[PDB]
Short mmCIF file of C-alpha atoms in Angstrom, two decimals:
data_model
loop_
_atom_site.label_atom_id
_atom_site.label_comp_id
_atom_site.label_asym_id
_atom_site.label_seq_id
_atom_site.Cartn_x
_atom_site.Cartn_y
_atom_site.Cartn_z
CA UNK P 1 -17.92 -133.92 -180.95
CA UNK P 2 -21.31 -133.42 -179.31
CA UNK P 3 -23.53 -130.68 -180.73
CA UNK P 4 -27.15 -129.66 -180.20
CA UNK P 5 -28.14 -126.16 -181.30
CA UNK P 6 -25.18 -125.27 -183.50
CA UNK P 7 -26.41 -121.71 -183.96
CA UNK P 8 -26.00 -118.22 -182.47
CA UNK P 9 -28.72 -116.56 -180.40
CA UNK P 10 -27.32 -113.59 -178.51
CA UNK P 11 -25.74 -112.12 -181.64
CA UNK P 12 -26.64 -109.16 -183.86
CA UNK P 13 -29.67 -110.11 -185.96
CA UNK P 14 -32.00 -108.21 -188.28
CA UNK P 15 -35.41 -108.61 -189.91
CA UNK P 16 -35.83 -107.78 -193.60
CA UNK P 17 -39.38 -106.59 -194.32
CA UNK P 18 -41.19 -104.76 -197.11
CA UNK P 19 -40.40 -101.06 -197.74
CA UNK P 20 -43.42 -100.24 -195.60
CA UNK P 21 -44.57 -103.35 -193.74
CA UNK P 22 -45.29 -103.48 -190.01
CA UNK P 23 -43.07 -105.96 -188.16
CA UNK P 24 -46.19 -107.36 -186.52
CA UNK P 25 -44.63 -108.33 -183.20
CA UNK P 26 -45.60 -107.87 -179.55
CA UNK P 27 -43.54 -107.29 -176.40
CA UNK P 28 -44.17 -107.09 -172.66
CA UNK P 29 -42.25 -105.15 -170.03
CA UNK P 30 -41.08 -101.60 -169.45
CA UNK P 31 -39.20 -99.62 -166.81
CA UNK P 32 -42.58 -99.55 -165.05
CA UNK P 33 -44.84 -102.10 -166.71
CA UNK P 34 -45.66 -105.14 -164.60
CA UNK P 35 -42.39 -106.82 -163.61
CA UNK P 36 -41.63 -109.00 -166.62
CA UNK P 37 -40.21 -111.61 -164.26
CA UNK P 38 -42.88 -113.30 -162.10
CA UNK P 39 -40.13 -114.30 -159.68
CA UNK P 40 -38.67 -110.92 -158.70
CA UNK P 41 -40.80 -107.75 -158.82
CA UNK P 42 -37.61 -105.72 -159.17
CA UNK P 43 -37.36 -106.72 -162.83
CA UNK P 44 -38.43 -104.33 -165.59
CA UNK P 45 -36.96 -106.42 -168.39
CA UNK P 46 -38.70 -106.57 -171.76
CA UNK P 47 -39.44 -109.83 -173.57
CA UNK P 48 -41.62 -110.73 -176.56
CA UNK P 49 -45.18 -111.53 -175.49
CA UNK P 50 -46.48 -112.43 -178.95
CA UNK P 51 -45.58 -112.49 -182.64
CA UNK P 52 -47.90 -112.11 -185.64
CA UNK P 53 -47.69 -114.80 -188.36
CA UNK P 54 -47.95 -112.27 -191.18
CA UNK P 55 -45.43 -110.03 -189.44
CA UNK P 56 -41.87 -109.57 -190.67
CA UNK P 57 -40.79 -111.63 -187.66
CA UNK P 58 -43.40 -114.38 -187.66
CA UNK P 59 -42.31 -115.16 -191.22
CA UNK P 60 -38.63 -114.47 -190.56
CA UNK P 61 -38.16 -117.64 -188.54
CA UNK P 62 -35.77 -116.24 -185.94
CA UNK P 63 -38.24 -114.07 -184.02
CA UNK P 64 -40.53 -115.86 -181.57
CA UNK P 65 -42.49 -115.31 -178.36
CA UNK P 66 -39.82 -115.60 -175.68
CA UNK P 67 -36.74 -113.86 -177.07
CA UNK P 68 -35.56 -111.15 -174.68
CA UNK P 69 -35.18 -107.84 -176.51
CA UNK P 70 -31.62 -106.67 -175.89
CA UNK P 71 -31.42 -103.77 -178.35
CA UNK P 72 -33.49 -102.60 -181.32
CA UNK P 73 -31.46 -101.05 -184.14
CA UNK P 74 -28.46 -100.52 -181.87
CA UNK P 75 -30.72 -98.74 -179.38
CA UNK P 76 -30.69 -100.30 -175.91
CA UNK P 77 -34.20 -100.31 -174.44
CA UNK P 78 -32.59 -99.69 -171.04
CA UNK P 79 -34.04 -96.50 -169.60
CA UNK P 80 -37.19 -96.18 -171.70
CA UNK P 81 -40.65 -97.53 -170.85
CA UNK P 82 -42.75 -100.13 -172.65
CA UNK P 83 -44.41 -97.33 -174.59
CA UNK P 84 -41.04 -95.97 -175.68
CA UNK P 85 -39.48 -99.39 -176.28
CA UNK P 86 -42.37 -100.44 -178.51
CA UNK P 87 -42.22 -97.29 -180.64
CA UNK P 88 -38.52 -98.05 -181.01
CA UNK P 89 -39.34 -101.36 -182.69
CA UNK P 90 -41.77 -99.71 -185.12
CA UNK P 91 -39.36 -96.83 -185.70
CA UNK P 92 -37.50 -98.87 -188.32
CA UNK P 93 -37.57 -98.41 -192.08
CA UNK P 94 -37.71 -101.79 -193.80
CA UNK P 95 -35.11 -103.61 -191.72
CA UNK P 96 -34.01 -103.44 -188.08
CA UNK P 97 -31.28 -104.98 -185.93
CA UNK P 98 -32.56 -106.97 -182.95
CA UNK P 99 -30.07 -108.35 -180.43
CA UNK P 100 -32.59 -110.80 -178.97
CA UNK P 101 -31.72 -114.35 -177.93
CA UNK P 102 -33.32 -117.65 -176.92
CA UNK P 103 -34.95 -116.60 -173.66
CA UNK P 104 -37.71 -119.14 -173.09
CA UNK P 105 -39.67 -121.40 -175.44
CA UNK P 106 -43.44 -120.93 -175.27
CA UNK P 107 -44.23 -124.45 -176.42
CA UNK P 108 -44.82 -125.72 -179.98
CA UNK P 109 -46.09 -123.45 -182.75
CA UNK P 110 -47.90 -123.76 -186.08
CA UNK P 111 -46.99 -122.43 -189.51
#
């Protein structure tokens, strides 16, 4: 009957990029980094803080600034710190598996 999105978000997704291209994405958080959630300081979650247009994601169409990073390449970011988590995203060959999902829209975008 009624339908709005009609698409998965918290499922297993991946980003196909060149054999040596940098994703070109940004994230904010960490087991220590400033509490990702401005509401509760006891939150070390990690969510995208920015995404490059020329990056594998920016072009992909599924990766945006607001998708909470659940796991990168079947590697839960739970336990590691921003520094570690980040390196985990760039530690992929030409394609990774992100389990992100619609977390919060950061307004309209261009391109």
